């Protein structure tokens, strides 16, 4: 957990050394106080609420005995933006005069300009001189003064009360804390990176990551080669290999040193910046093992030119270099979260395992064929069999070797692989006592390893199919439902198409869920972004405030209607106006097209004015794949109520492209023609209908 | 994403060339305007709202200087349905006279009839002649005219302001855009298919799919055979094989060409219709590799009759034909969504892998046995062993061959299969250096492949058992619960039966969930379909409107009651009337059957009239598997309130088959008999009861 943050207060607190201060805005008129620490409150005798919004020069704290010249000077300093210190008399809430050592400082910004102020205080009551308006005695006054001035005289100037002339050194020294602050009060209130000391590298750096990678590679190499060295016995013919080993050792040593320096992450503490502490932690955790791993033994052997027994035995100690793979637990934790890399890791392990077991097998073979001092080749073991098979058996004249050093290793590896992978060819196969046991052991291990690999693979398969399989299942269910309730061929098909289409468009993402997952402000922002086509285009929302916009966005849905898929049907409740950001719709009343609705159009019903739910007078079908942005009336109404000044503006602006409330008066042409035709062709039953007519007339008014 | 859509506006916009227009309904009287683009609005000086519903001839735009004859002509044209162009003077909102080149056009339909109108406009102010009612000067007027007529004179007629006599060519040319429109304004407002140009085939066609399938097959064939050719060396004995290869190459070439033409789907753009663009895209993506794959090398070799070195080397280049399987990534994306086909694909891959590795093995064998120039058969390799085994070893007189060309391949394949499948018989088995390494490699590959297959199988198994296993678990849980709370033997059993029965009926489908998954209108339609047995049968809903019906459907539940499973119990709240679409129920009051309720019956309580929740006066049991359609009173009430005219009708129509509110007055026959019997057998304590009687009497009034 790391990010750019403006840790301003914290730094000041750290520097403090148990001192008090206040903060004020520079660019605002009268220098208004915006913050005060608890110490200051304790001192002055005011709460944080009543202190804020007052002038930073402290107009409320002045009185009769306060010097005007000093105040003027302070004002001048404020105007000019300058670091200064002043001794000045001021009153408290309870009206007791106190001398304050006011150390002013202007704070710069990340844009190099002055923005905030700082002003630290300190009591110079007992130090400067005694004055009192009303008191029980002089002694009492003195006592009171002493009580007041505890922070300076108590903890910082605690070697001073024995030695005389504190004004020469002690007060000045105390002021030196403030002076230090002057540097510690230049963090500039800037959203900066986490401050780490020099001679230390970060936990999450690029360089560090590269180094880690390199170390991993080295460890892998060591794992590969050390066992080979142990078993097949190259016997350091070439010095190049030795040199390489030495280099590796050196690198390991360097890495150890780096580790001591570098930063760490705890469960509570996300970043640790203390070097000594980190060193201690390292020592506690993993130092000893690491150090044991990385001693350059070859180098040590080379120089002294001493005992043979001492040397050979020492060489044997190289077995411990296998423990170097302890570094791998850093990325194990760093890369276990991923699914796919785990498989790779497993594969690598398998390879390594095969190598190791091959080496062991070779060693066993070596042990077996010259076990007895009588020098019996024993017609058995795997190695002998191999020799017999590939040509070049064993003979004497001494003991002449059979198979080549390179081939043998390969053979061993093959055997190991067979054992592991459950193939089991059996060209090379276990015959002897120890050998058979070893084989059994490897099989036991091997099966488990294989099983684990399989499991991992299965899990991987599951965790990519899960997103689509669920969808498939859903689709199947829908189909079954349709089959069951015997839905007509067309409607069902349409539904299916819609379902498919949504999946194609979204790629399996619930928008609401995503929104929920995001926090409040972020969610609002996202919503705003989504409805940018609404707010930027239409004239209604250009005047709208930011808060208002945010509010609107939360309530705005969005609908992707298909071609020939009607939104509002004649009779249905008009409960939401709908903006058309794209596509094209048609409005059909009495099976006749009354209105086309294209890009940047609106329809629904004016709710805020009429204040009643109305029937939809006409059908509204969509022509193309039309994107609509709709909002439920109630929510909209609420929003309008909240933002009263905006409501009027909205009313003025938002002209609906077509109201679904209003009827349209019209006749069809065919009907008219028919009427005309009839015209050329052509009292007692008027009384039953006359009454009706009268009633109608009455209703009309 | 493709569907039949009436992209009417878009086509017009495309044709436009920065021009304005309005749309009006032909069949409606007075030719009402239903749409106007932004350009038109800008020109005339009106919003879209006030323009709509006016006459398309523009009665509001006329004035004093407007010619009546022209208007009459326009009217005549409208009446007759005819394409014409007219120059006519009209006013704007601000009352400035303007000459408009009004290009009228009637729009046909998919049913061949005329339905909509079009009428494009263009400013002929500066072009025709100058007239003004009020003006500052002539120059000013001219300037204004110029300002007005920018679309024609600015962009279309931009080579015209140098050359004289613009009325001869320029105006006419401008009108030619309109003329073009006349063709581009014959899309007919028909829900048509997506318009694609000729010489291009669709992405999702039947023919295209077939072609793709064929290509896949060809690729498979190539994968099978090319390696065989490389390894076993038929040496083109027959020309038939060569011919086949040539044919394949030709087909591939054809496919490439087809690909250049054919359509494409992007992430944003669902269909691409531009040919050049598609070609470019193809070039960017996959052209080069494909072209490299498909050169007919054999053909090239055949004709020239040139160098042997040149030929043989060239032949070697056929290795690249393995890369032809790049076509497979089209169906990989198309068929990864399915679970079952993936298994098949994997199997195919496995087969192919086995083939390939067999070929490699054979090659290795070939390399090995005559490695040295001394011609040493070396008593080893797999091939030699095989020869020794099946009869016919090697000999000389030259070098006579041992095993047959057909058998060997088969043997190799078998070996490969053994390696892969983890069987490992070991008739054929790795003995030599390179060979052993190869074997190891194959084992490493093979195990992984096998594991993947296993994983896939497991996933498949999971994704069909998941629907039923959950159900089983649920059942188990229910059983456990019953066991725990010690529910009586009968009730528990009944519950279990019900649970089973529901599962049997539904086949594991939550109806509500399905409904939710569907969108609004679709959902409503589905609901309506479901309650077709209600609405079509009963006389209540025949008069009901469509919107009303829709509203009702949303609120209508449906219940599948078992035999002997009572719905309403005496005392329970009657909060929902219930229609019986099927089955048969009995109503039991005081342990006596008062009413049978069969098909097309109703019961519950009249809510809308009485307006109070009442106790159920009697039990209501079901006889058979009865299907009920019920609706909660509150929802129904709301619906009724919404549709006021319908409510009265509903009240008039809906006669409940039996009210659960009302008591029935009756005596049992046995009781009567008893009373009668008693009759033949047979004042001071009247005063305690007299008071009670009096009270009762009082209550009565
Ligand atoms: C052999 C080692 C290498 C990785 C090991 C596995 C790594 C992780 C786990 C998860 C753990 O939980 C159970 C043991 C198991 C399967 C281990 C068993 C022993 C394994 C197979
Ligand atoms: C051998 C190839 C053929 C298919 C491959 C697999 C296809 C898909 C995936 C999913 C991927 O995620 C991890 C690797 C894996 C298992 C591949 C590993 C290597 C495999 C087994
Ligand atoms: C090993 O077997 C060989 C024959 O293959 C034989 O001559 C020999 O005596 C055997 N070795 C021993 C120690 O018995
Ligand atoms: C191969 O083995 C045979 C006996 O099976 C033998 O006669 C021959 O000499 C061996 N070949 C070589 C090159 O040693």
- Ligand 3: which of A379, A388, A431 to mutate, most ligand atoms within 8 Å of CB? A379
Distance CA B53, CA B49 (A): 9
Question: Which residues on adjacent β-strands are paired with residue B626?
Answer: B561
SS3 B597: strand
The DSSP H or E segment spanning A102 is: strand A98-107
Question: C-alpha distances in angstroms, B609 versus B255, B631, B636, B648?
Answer: 75, 16, 13, 10
Residues 6+ apart with CB under 8 A from B312: none
Question: C-alpha distances in angstroms, B240 versus B13, B224, B311?
Answer: 58, 17, 20
What is the sign of the dihedral through the CA atoms of A147, A152, A153 and A156? positive
State both tokens at B482.
């019953």
Q: Which of A425, A488, A667 sits opposite B29 (nearest CB)?
A: A667
Question: C-alpha distances in angstroms, B266 versus A298, A501, B82, B273, B283?
Answer: 62, 15, 43, 12, 15
Q: Does B469 touch chain A (CB under 8 A)?
A: no
Interior CA angle at B581 toward B580 and B585, to 5°? 40
Residue A623 DSSP code: S
Please name which of A231, A260, A553 lies closest in space to residue A365, comparing C-alpha atoms.
Answer: A231
Q: Do A477 and B509 touch (CB under 8 A)?
A: yes
Q: Do B440 and A413 touch (CB under 8 A)?
A: yes
State both tokens at B186.
């014959």
The beta strand positions in A108-162, using DSSP E, are 116-121
Among B35, B388, B452, B541, pick the best mutation site for testing chain A contact (most A Cβ within 10 A). Answer: B35
SS3 A21: strand
Residues 6+ apart with CB under 8 A from B635: B555
| B422: number of Cβ within 10 Å | 16
Contact of B458 with A456, CB cutoff 8 Å: no
| B208: number of Cβ within 10 Å | 15
**Ligand 2 contact via B452 beta carbon (within 6 Å):** yes
Helix orientation angle between B644-653 and B633-642, rounded to the nearest 10 degrees: 120
Distance CA A454, CA A364 (A): 30
**Residue whose pair of structure tokens reads 């008191």 in the numeric block:** A135
The DSSP H or E segment spanning A622 is: strand A619-622
**CA atoms in the 13 A half-sphere facing the CB of A559:** 22
Helix boundaries (H) for A37-101: 38-44, 48-51, 68-80
Pairing outcome for strands A20-25 and A116-121: antiparallel
**Residue whose pair of structure tokens reads 């033409």 in the numeric block:** B261
Helix boundaries (H) for A317-432: 329-335, 340-369, 382-390, 405-421
Atom of ligand 4 nearest to the CA of A391: 14
The DSSP H or E segment spanning A36 is: strand A33-36
State both tokens at B496.
């279990």
Q: Does A567 touch chain B (CB under 8 A)?
A: yes
Distance CA A149, CA A101 (A): 12
Q: Which of A413, A495, A657 sits opposite B49 (nearest CB)?
A: A657
Q: What distance separates the 2 farthest-apart alpha carbons in chain A?
A: 149
The DSSP H or E segment spanning B166 is: helix B166-184
Please give the full DSSP string across B321-361, using - where no structure is assigned. Answer: GGGGGGGGHHHHHHHSS-SHHHHHHHHHHHHHHHHHHHHHH
Please name which of A223, A233, A402, A406 lies closest in space to residue A326, comparing C-alpha atoms.
Answer: A223
Phi, psi of A209 (to 5 degrees): -60, -45
Please name which of A148, A182, A151, A152 lies closest in space to residue A170, comparing C-alpha atoms.
Answer: A152
Please name which of A553, A556, A559, A555 lies closest in space to residue A525, comparing C-alpha atoms.
Answer: A553
Please name which of B74, B83, B44 lies closest in space to residue B56, comparing C-alpha atoms.
Answer: B74
Distance CA A655, CA B381 (A): 90
What's the count of helices (H) and strands (E) in chain B, helices before strands?
28, 15
Helix orientation angle between B405-421 and B433-484, rounded to the nearest 10 degrees: 40
Distance CA A316, CA A300 (A): 13
**Ligand 4 contact via B380 beta carbon (within 6 Å):** no
Interior CA angle at A646 toward A640 and A651, to 5°? 80
Distance of CA A67 to the CA centre of its chain: 55
The beta strand positions in B534-610, using DSSP E, are 559-561, 573-574, 576-582, 585-588, 593-597, 601-604
**Total residues found in chain A within this entry:** 701
Distance CA A542, CA A561 (A): 27
Question: Which residues on adjacent β-strands are paired with residue B621?
Answer: B586
Question: Which residues on adjacent β-strands are paired with residue B596?
Answer: B586
Closest chain A residue to B2, measured at CA: A501
Rounded to 10 degrees, the C-alpha dihedral A380/A383/A384/A387 comes to 150
Among protein residues, the one with the nearest Cα to ligand 4's atom 4 is: B379
Distance of CA B507 to the CA centre of its chain: 24
Distance CA B629, CA B533 (A): 9
Distance CA B40, CA B65 (A): 22
Atom of ligand 3 nearest to the CA of A376: 13
The DSSP H or E segment spanning A87 is: strand A84-90
Helix boundaries (H) for B377-432: 382-390, 405-421
**Residue whose pair of structure tokens reads 């519903």 in the numeric block:** B53
User: What would the 3-class secondary structure string for B97-123 be?
Assistant: CEEEEEEEEEECCCCCCCCEEEEEECE
What technique was this entry resolved by?
cryo-EM
**Ligand 1 centroid – CA B443 distance (Å):** 22
**Ligand 2 centroid – CA B336 distance (Å):** 13
* CA-atom Rg of chain B in angstroms: 44
Residue B318 DSSP code: G
Q: Does B464 touch chain A (CB under 8 A)?
A: no
Please name which of B361, B350, B355 lies closest in space to residue B449, comparing C-alpha atoms.
Answer: B350
Phi, psi of A119 (to 5 degrees): -155, 100
Distance CA B457, CA B451 (A): 10
SS3 A540: coil
Residues 6+ apart with CB under 8 A from A515: A523, A526, A527
Contact of A572 with A592, CB cutoff 8 Å: no
SS3 B214: helix
Breaks (C-N over 2.5 A) in chain A follow: 397, 682
Mind telling me how many Å the CA of B652 is from chain A's nearest CA?
21
Residues in the ligand 1 pocket, defined by CB under 6 Å: A 448-449, 452
Distance of CA A496 to the CA centre of its chain: 39
* CA-atom Rg of chain A in angstroms: 44
Phi, psi of B119 (to 5 degrees): -155, 100
**Ligand 4 centroid – CA B379 distance (Å):** 6
Contact of A430 with A438, CB cutoff 8 Å: yes
**Ligand 2 contact via B316 beta carbon (within 6 Å):** no
State both tokens at A471.
């969808």
**Residue whose pair of structure tokens reads 């006011």 in the numeric block:** A102
Mind telling me how many Å the CA of A611 is from chain B's nearest CA?
15
Please name which of B162, B192, B188, B185 lies closest in space to residue B19, comparing C-alpha atoms.
Answer: B185
**Total residues found in chain B within this entry:** 701
**Ligand 2 contact via B336 beta carbon (within 6 Å):** no
- Beta strands across the sheet bearing A593-597: A593-597, A585-588, A619-622
SS3 A357: helix
Distance, first Cα to last Cα, chain A: 75
Atom of ligand 3 nearest to the CA of A379: 1
Pairing outcome for strands A601-604 and A658-659: parallel
SS3 B615: strand
State both tokens at A347.
């594969």
Contact of A191 with A4, CB cutoff 8 Å: yes
Residues 6+ apart with CB under 8 A from B363: B230, B231
* Cβ burial, residue A302 (10 Å; 0-12/13-18/19+): middle
The beta strand positions in B209-298, using DSSP E, are none
Closest chain A residue to B23, measured at CA: A596
Distance, first Cα to last Cα, chain B: 75
Q: Which of A571, A598, A669 sits opposite B546 (nearest CB)?
A: A571
**CA atoms in the 13 A half-sphere facing the CB of A435:** 22
């Amino acid at each position: 957990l790391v990010a750019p943050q403006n840790t301003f207060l914290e730094n000041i607190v750290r520097r403090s050394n148990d001192t008090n201060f206040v903060l004020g805005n520079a660019q605002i008129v009268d220098w208004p106080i915006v913050y005060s620490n608890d110490g200051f409150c304790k001192l002055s005798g005011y709460h944080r609420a009543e202190v804020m919004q007052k002038s930073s020069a402290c107009s409320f704290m002045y009185g009769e005995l306060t010097d005007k010249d000093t105040v003027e000077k302070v004002r001048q300093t404020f105007e000019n933006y300058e670091m200064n210190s002043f001794e000045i008399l001021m009153y408290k809430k309870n009206r007791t005069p106190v001398w304050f050592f006011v150390k002013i400082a202007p704070i710069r910004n990340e844009q190099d300009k002055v923005v905030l102020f700082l002003c630290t205080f300190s009591d110079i009551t007992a130090f400067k001189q005694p004055i009192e308006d009303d008191s029980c005695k002089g002694w009492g006054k003195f006592a009171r003064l002493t009580r007041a001035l505890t922070s300076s005289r108590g903890v910082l100037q605690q070697l001073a009360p024995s030695v005389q002339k504190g004004e020469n050194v002690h007060k000045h020294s105390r002021l030196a804390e403030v002076l230090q602050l002057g540097s510690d009060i230049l963090p500039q209130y800037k959203q900066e990176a986490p401050k780490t000391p020099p001679h230390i590298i970060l936990h999450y750096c690029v360089f560090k990551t590269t180094w880690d990678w390199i170390i991993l590679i080295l460890t892998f190499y060591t794992a590969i080669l050390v066992p080979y060295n142990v078993s097949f016995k190259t016997r350091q013919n070439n010095v190049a290999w030795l040199v390489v080993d030495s280099i590796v050792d050196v690198i390991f040593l360097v890495d150890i040193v780096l580790n001591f320096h570098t930063t760490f992450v705890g469960p509570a503490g996300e970043v640790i910046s203390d070097p000594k502490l980190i060193r201690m932690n390292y020592l506690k955790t993993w130092f000893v093992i690491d150090l044991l791993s990385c001693l350059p033994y070859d180098v040590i052997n080379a120089f002294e030119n001493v005992d043979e027994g001492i040397s050979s035995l020492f060489s044997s100690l190289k077995v411990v270099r296998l423990l170097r793979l302890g570094r791998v637990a850093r990325k194990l934790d760093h890369y276990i979260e991923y699914g796919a890399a785990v498989l790779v890791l497993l594969v690598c392990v398998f390879g390594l395992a095969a190598h190791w077991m091959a080496c062991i097998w070779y060693s066993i073979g070596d042990y077996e064929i010259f076990d007895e001092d009588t020098k019996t080749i024993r017609n058995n073991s795997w190695l002998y069999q191999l020799a017999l098979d590939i040509g070049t058996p064993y003979q004497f004249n001494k003991w002449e070797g059979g198979p080549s050093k390179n081939s043998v290793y390969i053979s061993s590896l093959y055997f190991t692989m067979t054992s592991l992978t459950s193939v089991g060819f059996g060209n090379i196969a276990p015959s002897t006592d120890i050998e058979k046991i070893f084989a059994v052991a490897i099989m036991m291990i091997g099966s488990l390893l294989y099983a684990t690999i399989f499991g991992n693979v299965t899990t991987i398969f599951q965790q990519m199919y899960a997103n689509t399989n669920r969808y498939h299942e859903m689709l199947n269910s829908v189909r079954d439902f349709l089959k069951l309730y015997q839905v007509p061929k067309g409607l069902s098909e349409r539904v299916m198409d819609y379902i498919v289409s949504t999946w194609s468009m979204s790629r399996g993402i619930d928008t609401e869920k995503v929104l929920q997952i995001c926090p409040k402000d972020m969610r609002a922002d996202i919503c705003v972004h989504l409805n940018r086509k609404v707010f930027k285009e239409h004239p209604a929302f250009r005047l709208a405030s930011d808060g208002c916009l945010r509010a609107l966005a939360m309530e705005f849905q969005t609908v992707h209607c298909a071609p020939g898929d009607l939104i509002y049907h004649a009779g249905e409740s008009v409960d939401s106006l709908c903006f058309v950001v794209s596509g094209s719709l048609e409005v059909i009343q009495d099976d006749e097209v009354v209105a086309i609705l294209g890009k940047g159009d609106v329809f629904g019903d004016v709710f805020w004015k009429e204040a009643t739910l109305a029937q939809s007078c006409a059908n509204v079908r969509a022509l193309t794949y039309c994107d609509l942005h709709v909002i439920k009336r109630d929510a909209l109404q609420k929003v309008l109520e909240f933002y009263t000044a905006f409501s009027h503006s909205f009313s003025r602006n938002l002209i609906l492209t077509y109201n679904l409330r209003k009827r349209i008066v019209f006749r069809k042409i065919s009907d008219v023609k028919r009427e005309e035709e009839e015209r050329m062709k052509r009292l007692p039953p008027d009384h039953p209908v006359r009454r009706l007519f009268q009633r109608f007339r009455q209703q009309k008014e």
